[PDB]
Amino acid sequence: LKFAHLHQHTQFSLLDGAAKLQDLLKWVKETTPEDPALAMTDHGNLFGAVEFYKKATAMGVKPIIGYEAYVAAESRFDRKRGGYFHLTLLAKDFTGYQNLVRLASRAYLEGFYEKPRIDREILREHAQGLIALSGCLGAEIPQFILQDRLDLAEARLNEDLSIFGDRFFIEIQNHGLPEQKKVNQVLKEFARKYGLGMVATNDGHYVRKEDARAHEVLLAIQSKTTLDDPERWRFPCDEFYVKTPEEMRAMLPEAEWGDEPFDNTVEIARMCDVDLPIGDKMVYRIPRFPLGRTEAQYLRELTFLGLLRRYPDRITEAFYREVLRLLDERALAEALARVEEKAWEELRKREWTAEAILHRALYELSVIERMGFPGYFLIVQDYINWARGHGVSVGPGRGSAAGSLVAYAVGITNIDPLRFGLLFERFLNPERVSMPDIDTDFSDRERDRVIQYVRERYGEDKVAQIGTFGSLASKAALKDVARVYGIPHKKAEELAKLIPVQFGKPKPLQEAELRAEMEKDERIRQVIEVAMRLEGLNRHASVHAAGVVIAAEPLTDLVPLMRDQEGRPVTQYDMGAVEALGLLKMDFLGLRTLTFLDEARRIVKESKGVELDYDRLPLDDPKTFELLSRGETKGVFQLESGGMTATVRGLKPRRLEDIIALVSLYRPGPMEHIPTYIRRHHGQEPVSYAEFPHAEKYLRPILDETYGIPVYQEQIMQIASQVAGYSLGEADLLRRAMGKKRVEEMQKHRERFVRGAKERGVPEEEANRLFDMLEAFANYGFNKSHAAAYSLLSYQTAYVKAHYPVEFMAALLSVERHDSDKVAEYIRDARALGIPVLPPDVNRSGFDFKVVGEEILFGLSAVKNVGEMAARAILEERERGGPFKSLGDFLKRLPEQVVNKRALESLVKAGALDAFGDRARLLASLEPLLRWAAETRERGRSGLVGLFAEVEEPPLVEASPLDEITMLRYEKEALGIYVSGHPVLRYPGLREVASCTIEELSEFVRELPGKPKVLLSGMVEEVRFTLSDETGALEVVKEDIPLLVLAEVERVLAQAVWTLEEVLEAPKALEVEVDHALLDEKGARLKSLLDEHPGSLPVYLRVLGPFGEALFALREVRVGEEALGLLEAEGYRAYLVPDREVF
Ligand SMILES: [Cl-]
Ligand SMILES: [Cl-]
Ligand SMILES: [Mg+2]
Ligand SMILES: [Mg+2]
Ligand SMILES: [Zn+2]
Ligand SMILES: [Zn+2]
């Protein structure tokens, strides 16, 4: 006797599934050795399939691919507020697999209501190659039976029979459920009546019986409730696990069920021969390109016609002509394209010269053609060179890609791969076949449009973004479980901080060494197990930012789909899984820095009429480096880090290759090689090669550009390529194989190394230690291809900040104008940078942030109630009739029809109409001026020329000025942020008692004790109230009332709060403000001046230190109030501040 499950859910039935793929697949194997099988039947997705099939296939288990599908009462198109039912589906042959992919695809695109649902209409369309099973208790035929509508169930059994035929079975499962008794007792009659045959299953959602609660909390996490709610999601019993053949016949006896429902499980799984193109198979689905030209010929053509642009001074019209005479401008490329590979190699045999370029070019192409990747390069180049002409910034490139010359010739890459040390052989190793990945950056604003270009260009059915499935984290796992177990949040987090952090993410709970915390509480015992019993599970399905696919055949025909909340065609198979099926995949990353370069250039073009042609700037521009050297990185890509900034200020880099090497070495590990870089760079330490005297004549060239440090991997490859006699290709393999650290496969390369090293120079003693030097540096060394690429951007950024520093800031502000916080911030940076930032101005403002003269001026768009039409409207009516002359002249040119009263209100509140006088006066005048305006046209449309038709706007109505607090209040209501001040500046008391500003909080606090308490004072902005200084914003746990807050910190949690008038009531103290320039003979100058008027007020000292500022609260002495009057009577600034103590 034996058995094999055909209904088993997995980690991939995301909401309710708790069976991890691995320990499930062994549990099935360890149960039955003989021809074991498992069907993967996830709830309405195919997420598992691939990554499952391949795990079981190399484990020793035959897999079967399946789908517990949601079938709608009626049409998948319905949206009824009947339901949706279950249905067990298995794919028997490969066509079946396709039709499964299709269904789950369609269930998502065409029929998504709550769950993704298929019609019986489409099921019938796609039945070819499928076996169905009557279904779990919630499926159709059983359900109807439960309802005493036998007459419908049999009718629906007939229907289903008309669809699959002798490939539909009656599903019999049993748990201790009375509903199952009645359903089967009839299902049993059916299978005998129509002549159907029964298959025994039992719907595993967990692996082994002990996974009961472990699972029954996974629910409590998907339901987000306590273990004791109730009403919390629960299953009906603890019986949904991968049972033994023996535990089965316990739910299905012998004299009641017979051998048929077992010997059918085995026999089905056998007839289910399904194979996924993978490994042994996997054909490259490189999509075709449209063009009397070879796929490869064109790419060749485009390259030539490219170099000529790329290298003006050294590849010419005349040059190509010379080549062809050894055998228009476009007309030469068209021809050089048609030289064959037997014909080419009759020239080489008869500093980067004109030839040198040809060779490398022709070589690259030779390796491209031979490999089968010319098409690829086209597809890629095409969409990129489109984005250029269509206002979509494209980054210089990323990763290995950069180093191919063809890549750079055809505008895929955009950095001269041979002016830097970039390598083709790192991007495409000639001596092993592997899909080269070409990732590309894009202006993030515009990225999707490129995807759309591809989408429309290659087919709406061939183009999708790739799926991503987050892992439950060991750290997080433990949290969520503890929520469930009725536990105080704190000790929860005291359990989280046990678990290590080995690299980026937390260590698995498998190895996790203060375990004695278990043996204390029996509550915690489970919590810890349960968390590791859940470790590997899944969250939900996000689109990958970068992932895109271009299939060659319709996607639906191999890879299933989804549409995400904002209508993206998404793949159900993950990154690897896709790439494992062998599909053309690519990253289309979004990149802020690019968008920022765009708005800068626009702002620059407007400011001073200068075309910023980023792909044509000198890379030796002094004033750029001198900035980075002064360490003014603030807005400059990549080197923005707290720490990294400091480094640069010491390195003082003079040429790009320094930014490149800085960037490359700055990360834990290599880091240390940085000081050396610096002392070598400042020119104070020789760069010596006495350790490999014979190898020097090979090293210097490679490592001199890097003050002697193997930083870049290419630098490594080259060393081997040159010293060992390695083909640059082979060289790569070396670096590759030293990465894999294959214990004893290394001593094979060692030999091949020395053996060649002799034949070139070094006498092995050097060789060995040199190889030692390689395996030493290679583990940390970097990809220059990538490094240099990005570096260029940092330069590009720095250059702007250096040469156009105002507009720079505007572009900053502009780009992130959608962050009330960042804007405030960017403002404050630019404010204390010599630049003023101005309110909008109906006269001077452009639409967006604008740079006028030397100031950053707002736009009208930024005004909160003003429509967008109305902003542009204002403008155009201000550019056909010139500059606005009065608020009258405004309201007659812009009727209420266009700018409503509300609009007007804010527009004044903003200060756009400041150009006219006092604000409060304006606001009240509006209404009676609109009564005037509207009346003017009534006169105007009644004949009457321009004197009888205008009683010209009587002067503005009158009212007392807007006091600051009330005035500032409006600005923000109107502009999201405050301009020209801040409430907290008006009543200083709160400043003077506060321990910090919001800015400094982070840096004052970290260094004190562990988890400190502190007092903070600013403005409130929430009903998790938000607190603001003139210096920042903090989440802390009504509107426009100032407070002082005593709160504990780690994000900051409040303990106590006081009202302004409670703070101006608590007794006062004296604070002398003192400069750092004080004498020995002053601290006892002050000391005596205080001694002479003692009392009961404490004394405080603000000592403005060179780097920071601290509050020395005197000592013994306590002054008696009268002191302030006699104290301001010397070069000392003073205040009667509230007394910091009390709080
Ligand atoms: Cl060295
Ligand atoms: Cl060294
Ligand atoms: Mg059905
Ligand atoms: Mg890629
Ligand atoms: Zn379920
Ligand atoms: Zn099920």
JSON list of N, CA and C in Angstrom, two decimals, residues 451 526 842 1021:
[
{"chain": "A", "resi": 451, "resn": "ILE", "atom": "N", "xyz": [9.33, 52.11, -20.78]},
{"chain": "A", "resi": 451, "resn": "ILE", "atom": "CA", "xyz": [8.61, 50.83, -20.67]},
{"chain": "A", "resi": 451, "resn": "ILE", "atom": "C", "xyz": [7.45, 50.79, -21.67]},
{"chain": "A", "resi": 526, "resn": "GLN", "atom": "N", "xyz": [7.19, 28.93, 22.70]},
{"chain": "A", "resi": 526, "resn": "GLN", "atom": "CA", "xyz": [6.51, 28.80, 21.41]},
{"chain": "A", "resi": 526, "resn": "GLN", "atom": "C", "xyz": [6.92, 29.95, 20.49]},
{"chain": "A", "resi": 842, "resn": "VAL", "atom": "N", "xyz": [2.92, 87.37, -8.69]},
{"chain": "A", "resi": 842, "resn": "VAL", "atom": "CA", "xyz": [2.07, 87.41, -9.90]},
{"chain": "A", "resi": 842, "resn": "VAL", "atom": "C", "xyz": [2.69, 88.16, -11.09]},
{"chain": "A", "resi": 1021, "resn": "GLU", "atom": "N", "xyz": [1.53, 70.51, 14.68]},
{"chain": "A", "resi": 1021, "resn": "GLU", "atom": "CA", "xyz": [0.93, 70.35, 13.35]},
{"chain": "A", "resi": 1021, "resn": "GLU", "atom": "C", "xyz": [0.17, 69.02, 13.13]}
]
